Amino acid sequence: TNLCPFGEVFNATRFASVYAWNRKRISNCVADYSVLYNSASFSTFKCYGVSPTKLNDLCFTNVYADSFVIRGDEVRQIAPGQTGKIADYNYKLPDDFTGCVIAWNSNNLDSKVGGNYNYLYRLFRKSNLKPFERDISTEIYQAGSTPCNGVEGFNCYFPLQSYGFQPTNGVGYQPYRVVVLSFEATVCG
């Protein structure tokens, strides 16, 4: 009888850092993916299971909306099969992914004169994440053979790096906000 609150994730005021990406469960509602598609001019909105209009026919047990901020030249890594610091250390999709990846340029909101350093991403990790894993730990990463003793130092790195979103950044370095929709019956078209 009522719509899904997609504006609760898309039009949210703040976004998570990618290494601590938000998941919002979506359920018990009716979702029109065609109005979401035409809700704005997204720079990216790419589905891997079926298309928007096709989705208005299906029903799902649950839909999940993961959201976070990355820089422009990393938006290509939010796709099944990709590699890179983001796809491997921050947010990983299953190879057998049924859902949509939705992104738009966020430069006006998420950059700042002199730099916004609130948005972080994981630069170092000893092994790849599993699909849909989230790691928010902050151990010193031991890049070489000598101990770190829990502090930054020689070959010993804090594992998160900040973006420095400045409004004058090149487009590959500008912030982008991403929503990933997963479709695993409460949610129908």
Partner: antibody, heavy 124, light 108 residues
Framework: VQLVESGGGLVQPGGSLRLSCAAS????????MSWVRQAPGKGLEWVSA???????YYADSVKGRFTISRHNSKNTLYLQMKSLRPEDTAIYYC???????????????????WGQGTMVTVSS | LTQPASVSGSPGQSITISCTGT?????????VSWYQQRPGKAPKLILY???KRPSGVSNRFSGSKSGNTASLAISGLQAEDEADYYC??????????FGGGTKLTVLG
Amino acid sequence: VQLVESGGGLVQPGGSLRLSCAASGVTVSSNYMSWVRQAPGKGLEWVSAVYSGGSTYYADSVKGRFTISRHNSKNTLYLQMKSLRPEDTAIYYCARLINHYYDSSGDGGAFDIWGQGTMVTVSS
Amino acid sequence: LTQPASVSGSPGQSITISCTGTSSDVGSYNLVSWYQQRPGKAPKLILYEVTKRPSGVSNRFSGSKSGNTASLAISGLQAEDEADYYCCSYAGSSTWVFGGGTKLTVLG
């Protein structure tokens, strides 16, 4: 290619001095850096190092008195000295300290790019 | 770190230059480096990670480690090798320690 130092001079005991190490052809903010000093007629002495995340380390003979830092907008490393003693008189070199990612095989751990040096004399 | 103050060799001969630290220095890590210094000039790296040579350093220069003592060996000794030589080692916890220096003379 190059690290160009400046800022050395004559200062009285208990005075202060800021050395600068302007880089060219390497990015300071992407490198471990160090200051190494050499008293006249003596050997090299490691003084200070800066690593990732702004972490900094110092020789015991220098803690509480020197501070290493950098300005990325100027691609320049600095050594800020206070409470200078006569035994701080030396040529001060800055150098790049290679690390694990230099070749991603071994740990590195050596100074391969060296400044010209700049002379610091602490005398009354 | 402890180095001999002086070392002598005739042209074409082979020398060795030792560098003795502690179980905390040379003994605990494979991070020994060596430096050549000429009067009025900055040090030049010639060995790191005990045994590796930078691009451009002649393989007349070689390095080794045994216990708490590293060694620098120079073969085919040339006049241009007359200089000061310094070993250096990781000293734990992101610190570094140099040897006192060795003055190499090429007897002429």
